[PDB]
Design a protein around this ligand. Structure first.
Ligand SMILES: CCC(=O)NCCNC(=O)/N=C(/N)NCCC[C@@H](NC(=O)C(c1ccccc1)c1ccccc1)C(=O)NCc1ccc(O)cc1
Length: 463
């Protein structure tokens, strides 16, 4: 019973006529991505390997990614292109089976590397106390990724067939003896289950996890090492991969679910445009690393012109031992007042209660950060209970919210609400009119201007 022959795609729009101009344009485009892919990745592989850095996890995974993109450029990319133009497979059955297998292996190898890099960067910012990413851990990761990528791509090597059966329906009576390189899965269910597996496990799934990682990193930094340029580059590499693959993912998925569609001409041109777009991702990564260099950027910008914790550690400082403030009251950490009493034993008692240990007038930076976390949490709940503070805070962004929290750390919940004039203008987004509008600038001019600039601009110019 030929149930396998019914799992082969049907094509019937022999009237495929593209102007030589468009074909030549595609040959130059594919030619450009083939050279940029082979040249850019080889350069990236050699540059990372020759630059010996004792502990670099991210770049080892970028070599992994660029080596798989180097494989596609040699083994897949030229073969897939001429095959679509000629409209018959002139290579071996080996190349026929290798073409979708090697491409599928490479998609999984690239995205699961990007998954590990997102984890690596998540562990460096969210949990720096653990600092788990090591080179040995990456070497196991790459070996797991390749072994699993191959195993999960084998149905392409197994069921992709070099066949001439689809040629029976399109006349072909009777001179050509031509072959097409088509997938021939065991059933409709086998195809749909496997294609869904690939879509969920290699595209929608991994990208969801990565975007959650970079968003958890984004939100942490706003509440809270010049590797910011790196994190923006790595994010723009995932966005690049996802955006280049999206049209091909949509195209292929439509054909996986509606396998009874007669593949026309228009579908051949549509596939080429989609495929070429997906091939752009195999050469963008080295162009990101090249444009990362600070000197080259300085040349570029000259030719073409185109956080609460850190804010308060500057404005109030960080102390691990009990000290007297400007008023003489016993403080600790980031402006944390213990008592307004003259007693030192009372302060040490209040400190021992807050921490839950016999501190003996001394704490660690972790106990100092937690005490500050407790302070800002108590400061934010007080802002919400206040009728003048709750509406202005809600309208304010994370940068200007940090400046309003900085203010409550200096005066208090009642002191800040005393600025009836300025609070109204900050609520109405009139920042410059509010910045010009107290004894606060008279007592400390340096600190007051540092927070006024953040209320006016909405960035960290002063810090
Ligand atoms: C695409 C990204 C993704 O993550 N997709 C998850 C879900 N589905 C999925 O991957 N499906 C398939 N069928 N992969 C092999 C595509 C081979 C080929 N496409 C076709 O012949 C399709 C076709 C149809 C009409 C005209 C021209 C081309 C076609 C699609 C479906 C059935 C039959 C023919 C092609 O795009 N080759 C490059 C390639 C190879 C492996 C791979 O995993 C991704 C990309």
């Amino acid at each position: 019973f030929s149930e396998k022959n019914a799992q082969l795609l049907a094509f019937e729009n022999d009237d495929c006529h593209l102007p030589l101009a468009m074909i030549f344009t595609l040959a130059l485009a594919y030619g450009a991505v083939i050279i940029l892919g082979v040249s850019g990745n080889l350069a990236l592989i050699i540059i990372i390997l020759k630059q010996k850095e004792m502990r670099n996890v991210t770049n080892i995974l970028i070599v992994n990614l660029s080596f798989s993109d180097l494989l596609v450029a040699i083994m897949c990319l030229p073969f897939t292109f001429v095959y679509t133009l000629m409209d018959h497979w002139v290579f071996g059955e080996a190349m026929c089976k290798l073409n979708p297998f090697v491409q599928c292996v490479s998609i999984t190898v690239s995205i699961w590397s990007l998954v590990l890099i997102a984890v690596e960067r998540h562990q460096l910012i969210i949990n720096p106390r653990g600092w788990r990413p090591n080179n040995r851990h990456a070497y196991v990761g790459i070996a797991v990724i390749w072994v699993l990528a191959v195993a999960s791509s084998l149905p392409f090597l197994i069921y992709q067939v070099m066949t001439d059966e689809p040629f029976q329906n399109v006349t072909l009576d009777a001179y050509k003896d031509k072959y097409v390189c088509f997938d021939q899965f065991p059933s409709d269910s086998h195809r749909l289950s496997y294609t869904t597996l690939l879509l969920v496990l290699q595209y929608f799934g991994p990208l969801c996890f990565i975007f959650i990682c970079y968003f958890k990193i984004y939100i942490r930094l706003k509440r809270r090492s010049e590797t910011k340029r790196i994190n923006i580059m790595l994010l723009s590499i995932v966005v690049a991969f996802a955006v280049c693959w999206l049209p091909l993912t949509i195209f292929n998925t439509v054909f996986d679910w509606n396998h009874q569609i007669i593949a026309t001409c228009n579908h051949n041109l549509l596939f080429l445009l989609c495929h070429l777009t997906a091939m752009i991702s195999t050469c963008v990564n080295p162009i990101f690393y090249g444009f990362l260099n600070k000197n080259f950027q300085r040349d570029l910008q000259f030719f073409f012109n185109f956080n609460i914790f850190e804010m308060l550690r500057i404005d109030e400082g960080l102390r691990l031992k009990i000290y007297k403030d400007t008023e003489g009251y016993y403080t600790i950490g980031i402006g944390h007042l213990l008592t307004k009493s003259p007693s030192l034993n009372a302060a040490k008692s209040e400190l021992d209660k807050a921490i839950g240990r016999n501190t003996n007038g001394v704490i660690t930076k972790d106990e100092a950060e937690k005490l500050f976390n407790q302070d800002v949490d108590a400061a934010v709940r007080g802002i919400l209970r206040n009728a003048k503070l709750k509406p202005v805070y809600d309208s304010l962004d994370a940068v200007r919210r940090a400046a309003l929290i900085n203010m409550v750390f200096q005066m208090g919940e009642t002191g800040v609400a005393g600025f009836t004039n300025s609070l109204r203008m900050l609520q109405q987004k009139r920042w410059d009119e509010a910045a010009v509008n107290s004894r606060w600038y008279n007592q400390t001019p340096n600190r007051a201007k540092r927070v006024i600039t953040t209320f006016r601009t909405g960035t960290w110019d002063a810090y």
